[PDB]
């Protein structure tokens, strides 16, 4: 009833990497959003001009050293912060902005649904936004899309949902060498083992999160989370510039939760990662299954976990910034959609 | 910012048809649902029990005469009109409930998307339901999913959409005589060109509010429409209790559409529809593909249109109620999920 709705929305950003940058150059090709100010904590970065960095010349927007002299300079209406997967650091960024007036979309995974794993930290964002009659949103494509939103929405057209099973399988040959060392590429099993247990193999951020705001959203509760991170054992030769994996050797992690309550079995999600998942006959792509009234069975090849992120994260802008106060899911706003270039 | 949040929702139902007795049978199974009141204008239902109809014993729920008395005496918070597809039938339903300050949901089919087709109509209700401080939409399976809804979800995770091209593929076969006429099953070439003219036969309603939602959604325009109805014609034996289809005999109706702007195609929407496709291999689903940056190709079977107009329907009461007065569109709600059974 007192929303005061724009026509255009300015945008800052906190985070100067593979995803904030794209992010940058989403919004600048834009016609209803204009990147008006960039942070980055690297040297690299901070005083260059955005548009050099991004190879299009000079635009006049730079890097400021600090957010808040970024977000008192610029005056963007929404900070989005593309830095850390965990809600233990992004936390404090993201408050920081809140404080300053402004709304944020971050895309940290543990951000996506934080309400049941980190519900001190979640209600703690919470309550500030309200306090400062802004709002915040985690988004991304997983999680903040495939094993979540798009799930979510497919029960829309169901009468009652027993069960749902998801997977989505990727191709990790396209990447780097700190991707490959996450999901234990190129390691015999007896280094992926240690590699698990020393955390320098992750496997996926935000199984959990995806899986709270499922059961949130149908109106489940959930008791009892199993994970598990199973290397995938190559029988051929995948080469990438980065990685060489022979036979015997580990192609990447087969990371699966399953989510329960009293010991029935409701979500299950499957997250293979590897590299050159074809040489053994695996097809990439998101897949999901509904088991309810009706069943109901879902991309192939897969929707492109780094363009799509930067996509929904510039996408969401406008209506977080005409949303309501508070810590927002997905769930909560409406359906995405893709911002109109210039 | 004035919204009073209410956590349970009284439900009337004007139309007890096909489905609208679905959606009363499925409102009776939510745990945050209460049905109050029918009405619909033939005899058999009238003074009635609901629960006796739907073959569940006497619930004290009865079909009233008239919708006005309905509304009055059972005072619930929405009306769902499951009644007629056209807006010319339909807007005067619609304003009727509006004018005694409840909302409202049509499946109609040309209240999916009214505002290019039937703008006077369109602007007649959006004002009705804003002077009421109440709000409309209209939803289904097709319209209100499928070729609009699910299509504009997935252009979340683009960076920027060139084209669309989506089918829908359906079986005919449960269905009744009414339906087979509709699309033309069991007729002959030149029978079937008689009662496209005399439009006995009608192919689907809706491509146009499906084609202007995704363009507004977007920030398309759209200046040209070119439909297609074509006789699909079979080389086979296709046959139910109320249909005989023989080699050369037309098994159905090929409903295309095609939206330019400026003789540039930007949507295409197929909808072939037909008795027992499989007989030559073709197989029923819904399929999107969306050309951008990234492309997007995802449904088999397809969703049920019976059952998930019913889902839907159902599904977005909670929304409709809470949400801003005014004629409104899938497109400005939260996100459709599946309402948790008692
Ligand atoms: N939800 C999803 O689907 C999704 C998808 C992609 C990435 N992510 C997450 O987004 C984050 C960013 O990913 P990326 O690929 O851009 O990583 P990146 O390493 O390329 O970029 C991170 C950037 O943030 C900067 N930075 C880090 N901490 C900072 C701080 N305290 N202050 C200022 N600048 C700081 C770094 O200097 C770097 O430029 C990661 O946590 C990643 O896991 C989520
Ligand atoms: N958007 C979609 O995907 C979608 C899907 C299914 C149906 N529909 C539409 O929904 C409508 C209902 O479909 P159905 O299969 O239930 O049809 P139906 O013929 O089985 O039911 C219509 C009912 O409405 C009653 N009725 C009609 N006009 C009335 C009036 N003026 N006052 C009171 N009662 C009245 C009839 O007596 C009948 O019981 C149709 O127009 C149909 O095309 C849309």
């Given at each position: ?11 800052g ?59 008192k ?69 997983n999680?903040?899309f495939?094993?979540?939103?798009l ?34 590429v ?68 087969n ?8 010991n ?79």
């Amino acid at each position: 009833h007192h929303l005061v709705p724009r026509g255009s929305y300015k945008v800052g950003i906190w985070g100067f990497g593979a995803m904030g940058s794209g992010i940058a150059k989403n919004i600048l090709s834009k016609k209803n959003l204009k990147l008006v100010g960039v942070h980055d904590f690297r040297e690299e970065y901070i005083e260059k001009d955005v548009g050099e960095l991004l190879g299009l010349g000079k635009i006049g927007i730079k890097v400021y050293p600090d957010p808040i002299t970024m977000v008192k300079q610029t005056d963007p209406d929404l900070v989005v912060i593309a830095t850390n997967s965990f809600i233990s650091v992004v936390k404090d960024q993201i408050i920081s902005i809140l404080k300053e007036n402004k709304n944020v979309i971050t895309i940290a995974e543990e951000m996506a649904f934080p309400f049941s794993k980190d519900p001190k930290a979640a209600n703690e964002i919470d309550t500030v936004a309200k306090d400062h009659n802004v709002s915040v949103l985690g988004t991304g494509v997983n999680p903040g899309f495939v094993l979540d939103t798009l799930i979510i929405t497919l029960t829309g057209i169901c009468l009652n949902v027993q069960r749902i099973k998801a997977a989505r399988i990727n191709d990790l040959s396209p990447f780097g060498p700190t991707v490959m060392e996450t999901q234990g590429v190129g390691t015999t099993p007896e280094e992926f083992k240690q590699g698990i247990k020393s955390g320098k193999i992750v496997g996926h951020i935000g199984f959990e999160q995806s899986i709270h705001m499922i059961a949130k959203a149908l109106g489940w509760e959930i008791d009892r989370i199993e994970q598990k991170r199973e290397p995938i054992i190559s029988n051929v030769m995948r080469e990438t510039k980065y990685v060489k994996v022979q036979p015997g050797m580990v192609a990447g992690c087969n990371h699966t939760a399953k989510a329960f309550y009293k010991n029935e079995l409701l979500i299950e999600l499957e997250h293979p990662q590897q590299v050159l998942p074809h040489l053994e006959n695996v097809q990439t792509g998101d897949y999901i299954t509904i088991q309810g009234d009706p069943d109901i069975s879902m991309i192939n090849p897969e929707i492109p976990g780094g363009k799509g992120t930067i996509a929904i994260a510039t996408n969401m802008i406008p209506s977080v910034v005409e949303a309501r106060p508070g810590l927002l899911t997905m769930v909560d706003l409406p359906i995405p959609r893709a911002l109109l270039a210039e």
